[PDB]
Design a protein around this nucleic acid. Structure first.
Ligand code: MG
Ligand code: MG
Ligand code: MG
Ligand code: MG
Ligand code: MG
Ligand code: MG
Ligand code: MG
Ligand code: MG
Ligand code: MG
Ligand code: MG
Ligand code: MG
Ligand code: MG
Ligand code: MG
Ligand code: MG
Ligand code: MG
Ligand code: MG
Ligand code: MG
Ligand code: MG
Ligand code: MG
Ligand code: MG
Ligand code: MG
Ligand code: MG
Ligand code: MG
Ligand code: MG
Ligand code: MG
Ligand code: MG
Ligand code: MG
Ligand code: MG
Ligand code: MG
Ligand code: MG
Ligand code: MG
Ligand code: MG
Ligand code: MG
Ligand code: MG
Ligand code: MG
Ligand code: MG
Ligand code: MG
Ligand code: MG
Lengths: 129, 150, 25, 144, 99
RNA sequence: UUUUUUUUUUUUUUUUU
RNA sequence: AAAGCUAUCCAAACUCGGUCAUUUAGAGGAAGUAAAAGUCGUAACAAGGUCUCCGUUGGUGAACCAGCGGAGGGAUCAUU
RNA sequence: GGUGAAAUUCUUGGAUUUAUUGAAGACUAACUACUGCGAAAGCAUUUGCCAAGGAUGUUUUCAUUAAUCAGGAACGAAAGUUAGGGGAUCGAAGACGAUCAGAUACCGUCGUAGUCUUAACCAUAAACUAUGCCGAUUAGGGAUCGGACGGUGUUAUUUUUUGACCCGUUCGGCACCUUACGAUAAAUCAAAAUGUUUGGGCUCCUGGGGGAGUAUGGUCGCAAGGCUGAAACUUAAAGAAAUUG
RNA sequence: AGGACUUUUACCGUGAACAAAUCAGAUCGCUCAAAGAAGGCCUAUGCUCGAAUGUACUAGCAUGGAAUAAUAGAAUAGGACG
RNA sequence: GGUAAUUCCAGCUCCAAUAGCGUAUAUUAAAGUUGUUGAGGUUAAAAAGCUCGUAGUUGAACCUUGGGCUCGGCCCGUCGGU
RNA sequence: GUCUUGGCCAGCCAUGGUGACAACGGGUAACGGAGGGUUAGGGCUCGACCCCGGAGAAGGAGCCUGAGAAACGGCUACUACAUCCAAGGAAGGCAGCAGGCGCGCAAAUUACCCAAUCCCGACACGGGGAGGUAGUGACAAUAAAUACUGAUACAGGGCUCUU
RNA sequence: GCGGGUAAACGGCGGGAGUAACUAUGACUCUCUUAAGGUAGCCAAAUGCCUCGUCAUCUAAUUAGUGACGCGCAUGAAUGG
RNA sequence: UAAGGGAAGUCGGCAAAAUAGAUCCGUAACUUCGGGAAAAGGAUUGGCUCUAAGGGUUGGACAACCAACUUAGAACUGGUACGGACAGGGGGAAUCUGACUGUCUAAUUAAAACAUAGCAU
């Protein structure tokens, strides 16, 4: 039984990345997945991702540029306070200037660095570096 | 896989992307609903109705042709079965095993299957009571199964 | 000693223990 | 690893499972059951006093051939009988029948230490005088 | 240590297989685990084939062949030198010896 | 492919350009 | 208006049973552990000299033995 | 007869052997496979009946109805128990004959319970793939089983369909072969991989070796026993995989 | 300031309130230090700085945020609208 | 430690702390040997014989996005106005 | 009835209340907390004891006075313990400060004083074993003695030379 | 008469000597002997002479009672345990 | 019938005493799960004055005319007595033995003896 489609997408992405493949097929399609992909794309850790429309959950084909070390999800989505970002970043990321911890806040899917600017917090859902 | 077996076999029907009636159909939505009502009035189950329409009369998908699924058409026309298809076939199957188990007592394999058949009925009837298809006081009883099927 | 017959020896000793308790009871 | 629950509302299962599995920890089980207060020869205390009942010799475990000098001591506080090792060369002469001696732990946490089998306590003071003080030329045994 | 990938038999997916009796021990062993030899040899030894042909009357008679299926346990096959202990790498070779 | 039981305690190794 | 007195109420205490909890004596019986130059066998480790082990049953000074079913952790990854 | 060799044993009352027939009970050889079905335990002669099941195909239907599960329940080899039937073979216990220092064993001749069946219990196995269930992804390859599809040519039938064989594709299985981008302490593993770059979901179990799956209490059982399940005390190792002798 | 119309919970931000002592921590040459809350300046006449600051998890109170996680809504229309 | 004792009893010498040092017991770190972070379960201890199933835990995708008009604060540069 | 609400209690009526999200029962060598120890983060453990709250005054119960007590350096009764006696009677509560016995591995003087902090009284005036001072005190903590120095003789490391 | 079967047919079911690093006892060994040498159980029992057996409990005191022990004159398995 | 004691009497609690109905409470080991069990052990009981409940018939959650017992509640009352006579279990912890119900030595032995179901030949 599918329980975390976000984990399925990131696991498939990471498997293709470690194998050296330049692209990966992702099923199914979710609003969280697309927003999570766009966070990758803004920092350039991926390239083009294309969504195939269907009369069901869609598919995504992501073109990988090879500059992607590790992407993973967090289960459950712990409720994080503003004072807890630094502990979460330290215990989970490499050196604190490359990776980006992904949260879901009332402002939407967005980074841990962006949270410090906007002074908001929420639930941790993933990470990359 | 299967809910009551190892059974990891994938086999289904792939609905085409069209969502539009093909150009070779010249039948009116009024006509096909008349076909649906006539078949249901005779006694055909909504699963059986789709088969005969698809195989003989060329209706690939009733929803594509009309816009409503067969059961919602039947309820609108007041011809929906009192008992849902899913329970009726499951209860009828359980009744069949009982008559075999009464005669054959050493069939411990048939005894085990009856438990699985009964377990599906209880899980199913629990869902119908949740959505409101069946009364909350509806209960499947061993000796009363034959009465419901008749 | 084999564990199969260490188990048998203890199991025999347990049966004798229950008889001694029934005698007192 | 283990198939531990990972839901956000599974704290009850996580705490209950930890409480059950913590009993297998030997040191927590000893403290939680309070076995020192129940079964230990001492009442959980570091030391205890008793009356010397007799002097016994204990053969050393292999590979070691010697007679470790010990005394059977009946504790005053509860009446339990234990065997106490008498350390240092020739200190068994100071101890005598019906003396009042103070006993302590012998090594680590009630386990016998060294090649002395079944001895888990040692003599510290005799007649209110330290055994080392008697063994050295420092103090004198009470006149009595 | 697991000595063999197939344990000692061939019943993966079979659950339980009825046992058989060893040929020269009567040991009760499973049919797939047992070591089976199908032997086809002339009913008369090659040394005495000529004399049988001499007594042929009726001189076109072909001597029939005995058709035996010998089933052995592990202890009997090894002691009878039907099979031999092989090296760690040579144990995996599932090919009959060449002629 | 006749059979072949047992072996008193302890004791059996270290450093650098 | 004191002593006293009527009837409820609060109720110490004792006796008599019940129940729970915790200690403790006991003829005798049956175990465990430790200590070693004790007696008897040699069951296991090699095909340990009857391959070993598991469940069950019965028997024997003792390790153990045997019947039924199973496993290889086998002494066979294999016979066209 | 039987064995390494013998002996107990049967035998001129004809043993053993030969042929024919009958009775009894059990079992289903060769075909039989790195094959199949079943949740597992297990399941191998023919025929008929009864009910069930997976895979396949589907442009049929419902529309979240799902996954795993503390307690709870069904089934559960062999052995064992109760009451009948049956009782051929084999064979615990037992009696002998050998061997041996002894032989309450291995070996041989007998032989009771049992082995078979109906009704009712028992609920344990090295019940093992020592590898929990669901889901996604990840290197190649050839066999094989069931279904489906496309093509080709022989063969039997045929108002040209179907079966057998051939090639290929795909779904679902039992497995297997080489390799390590990986894992492990290693043996080895396409899972025991995607884990110090540590979070997909759920349940169960373990915390040095003994004492001990023991004592006690509870509960189930006709009993044998099953399930639950300690502590005192003792000990510096026990153990796993490989290496050289 | 009176009334009407707000889906409801979880979550995050902010704010109020939240004994001392303890802890972190600012200042002062108790001869240094542990400590203590002192002290310092003018010759005097008397003049003055201090005795800070942080800390209130979870529960409760007020407001904002509306992604994420849940729940309802019109189907025998017994639905909305003047 | 069994007649050459670097380990016992002593003499000498030296080492550590030093007005202190040793010992016994309790607890913490070490202990990723209690593991939520963060253990292990083929063979080292450990997947219930197997299936069904309640409480519990968890549970496919989907509903306002996109663009433009702007306005302001802060930060990163040269202009430095004194 | 109570200062007052209340199944707090007395009468009448109904059958409800809690529980697998652990009720009820048992253990605690359990007074609760602010906090102590030790930890990168997450934690583990202790908290009789200088402060806040609760309860008790040998073990229960009852009560007077009083704004305030179920008070105990108040009373009454019972149980245990215990004091004087002329044997008729009377009198008692150190878990307040010292001190003694016992218990234990385990813990100080039957000292001085209201001068300091505050409290009480009719009160500037008196009282306070609250409290302060001193004695015992290696609980723990801070600083810090047991020695400093010149030359002579010798040796080493250097320096100009190695006659 | 000879030969075989039959004990839920009647019935029966042994002695002596040596031996374990204190002593004691004898798991063990040797020998005579039987149709077989009393197995599981149980006991000074309504069955034990010696005997008021030895130990414990019951009492102030117990040849009584009860619980154990067991070379049991002379216990014991459908003469059923 | 007996003061105080309470089996010291006796081979031995023989004989006698004690308990005794009804209602409410409470009830152990053991067990063949059926019992033990009336286990053990407690409380109440009179009279008088009341109150309430439990029905039938005929006329449409009502009205009227009948009916005789049972149960429950409350005041008052008395030399605290009340199943006031009669009637009416003593109990518990064990050992030996026979499973149990049943039967016999008329006129000294009622038992462990006989029988029985069950088992076997
Ligand atoms: Mg699938
Ligand atoms: Mg399921
Ligand atoms: Mg269900
Ligand atoms: Mg969650
Ligand atoms: Mg050693
Ligand atoms: Mg099997
Ligand atoms: Mg040897
Ligand atoms: Mg020997
Ligand atoms: Mg030996
Ligand atoms: Mg072996
Ligand atoms: Mg091996
Ligand atoms: Mg003949
Ligand atoms: Mg087949
Ligand atoms: Mg056949
Ligand atoms: Mg079918
Ligand atoms: Mg098991
Ligand atoms: Mg297993
Ligand atoms: Mg998978
Ligand atoms: Mg295939
Ligand atoms: Mg095929
Ligand atoms: Mg298959
Ligand atoms: Mg541990
Ligand atoms: Mg352990
Ligand atoms: Mg090894
Ligand atoms: Mg570990
Ligand atoms: Mg092992
Ligand atoms: Mg293991
Ligand atoms: Mg399994
Ligand atoms: Mg849900
Ligand atoms: Mg206390
Ligand atoms: Mg205390
Ligand atoms: Mg009072
Ligand atoms: Mg005092
Ligand atoms: Mg007799
Ligand atoms: Mg007399
Ligand atoms: Mg008579
Ligand atoms: Mg008479
Ligand atoms: Mg009789």
């Amino acid at each position: 039984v599918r329980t975390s489609v976000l984990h399925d997408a990131l696991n498939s992405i990471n498997n293709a990345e470690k194998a050296g493949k330049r692209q990966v097929l992702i099923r199914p399609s979710s609003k969280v997945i697309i927003k999570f992909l766009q966070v990758m794309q803004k920092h350039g850790y991926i390239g083009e991702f294309e969504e195939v429309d269907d009369h069901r959950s869609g598919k995504i084909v992501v073109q990988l540029n090879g500059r992607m070390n590790k992407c993973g999800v967090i289960s459950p989505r712990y409720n994080v306070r503003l004072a807890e970002l630094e502990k979460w970043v330290v215990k989970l990321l490499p050196a604190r200037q490359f990776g980006y911890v992904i949260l879901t806040t009332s402002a939407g899917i967005m980074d841990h660095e962006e949270a410090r600017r906007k002074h908001v917090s929420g639930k941790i859902i993933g990470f990359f570096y | 896989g299967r809910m009551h077996s190892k059974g990891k076999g994938i086999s289904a029907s792939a609905i085409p992307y069209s969502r539009n009636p093909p150009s070779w159909l010249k039948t009116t939505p009024e006509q096909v609903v008349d076909q649906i009502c006539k078949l249901a009035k005779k006694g055909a189950t909504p699963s059986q109705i789709g088969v005969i329409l698809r195989d003989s009369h060329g209706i690939a998908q009733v929803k594509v042709v009309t816009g409503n699924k067969i059961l919602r058409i039947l309820k609108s026309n007041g011809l929906a079965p009192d008992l849902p298809e899913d329970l009726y076939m499951l209860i009828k199957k359980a009744v069949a095993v009982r008559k075999h188990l009464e005669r054959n007592r050493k069939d411990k394999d048939s005894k085990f299957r009856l438990i699985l058949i009964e377990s599906r009925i209880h899980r199913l009837a629990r869902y119908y009571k949740t959505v409101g298809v069946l009364p909350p006081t509806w209960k499947y009883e061993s000796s009363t199964a034959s009465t419901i099927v008749s | 000693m084999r564990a199969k017959w260490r188990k048998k020896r203890v199991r025999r000793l347990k049966r004798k223990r229950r008889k001694m308790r029934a005698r007192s009871k | 690893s283990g198939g531990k629950p990972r839901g956000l509302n599974a704290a009850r299962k996580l705490r209950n499972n930890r409480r059950e599995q913590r009993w297998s920890d030997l040191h927590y089980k000893k403290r939680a059951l309070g076995t020192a207060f129940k079964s230990s020869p001492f009442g959980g205390s570091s030391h205890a006093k008793g009356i010397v009942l007799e002097k016994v010799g204990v053969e050393a475990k292999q590979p070691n051939s010697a007679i470790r000098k010990c005394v059977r001591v009946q504790l005053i506080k509860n009446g339990k009988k234990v065997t106490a090792f008498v350390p240092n060369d020739g200190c068994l002469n100071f101890v005598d029948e019906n003396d009042e001696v103070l006993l302590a732990g012998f090594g680590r946490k009630g386990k016998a230490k060294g090649d002395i089998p079944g001895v888990r306590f040692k003599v510290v003071k005799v007649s209110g005088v330290g055994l080392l003080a008697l063994w050295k030329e420092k103090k004198e045994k009470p006149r009595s | 240590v697991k000595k063999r990938k197939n344990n000692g038999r061939n019943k993966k997916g079979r659950g339980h297989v009825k046992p058989i009796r060893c040929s020269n021990c009567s040991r009760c062993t499973p049919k797939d685990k047992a070591i089976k030899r199908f032997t086809i040899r002339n009913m008369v030894e090659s040394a005495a084939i000529r004399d049988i042909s001499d007594a042929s009357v009726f001189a076109e008679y072909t001597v029939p062949k005995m058709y035996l299926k010998l089933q052995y346990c592990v202890s009997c096959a090894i002691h009878g030198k039907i099979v031999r202990v092989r090296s760690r790498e040579g144990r995996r070779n599932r090919a009959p010896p060449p002629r």
